[PDB]
Amino acid sequence: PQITLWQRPLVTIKIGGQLKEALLNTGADDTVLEEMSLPGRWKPKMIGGIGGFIKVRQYDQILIEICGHKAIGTVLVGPTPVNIIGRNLLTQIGCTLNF
Amino acid sequence: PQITLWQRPLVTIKIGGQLKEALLNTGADDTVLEEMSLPGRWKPKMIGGIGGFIKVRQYDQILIEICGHKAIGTVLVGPTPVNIIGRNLLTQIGCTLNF
């Protein structure tokens, strides 16, 4: 689909058997989701944004469905204010910027 | 142009007579630029991101050139880790997901 930006570019995702909404985020290298229950092992990680840093758990090779497009990659879970789909997953669904 | 996301989507901007690089940021409602010299009156504002909140100066009706596309709007200036072009200006230059 083509998505314009007059509104937040929110899409439906399915991950860990659960449905959520997430923001397509070109300003995000990685994907960061609010606290959720994800299955297997993880690693502690720290990531910085505009106002400082948060602790997140890193899950590798997680399957995620983003607006009907399946991708597998790293997902970070932690006290992010919004679910963010970063470029790591955006490239998998073939997402581009255009103007 | 069309821009893929295997790399940060950085573009050249000109603002306040100065040249800078900035990230095209669909995850950002507003535009936030690192500390720089801008002329005129401004207003205090607080903005939140992943790790907390920062104080910025809000400048309205600012002319900015983004990869050769002129836009006029609000620019926030403060201790952001990177220059980010938000949806407020992305809509003006017609930025989407076209191909």
Ligand SMILES: COc1ccc(C[C@H](NC(=O)O[C@H]2CCO[C@H]3OC[C@H](O)[C@H]32)[C@H](O)CN(CC(C)C)S(=O)(=O)c2ccc(OC)cc2)cc1
């Ligand atoms: C470290 O330097 C920064 C710093 C910041 C970024 C923009 C942000 N992305 C972000 O926080 O990325 C994090 C998590 C993903 O992996 C990484 O990608 C780069 C960064 O290192 C990591 C994000 O897209 C835009 N944010 C809005 C989000 C809902 C929080 S916002 O910057 O806080 C913001 C802008 C405007 C506004 O108006 C009122 C309010 C807030 C990118 C680089």
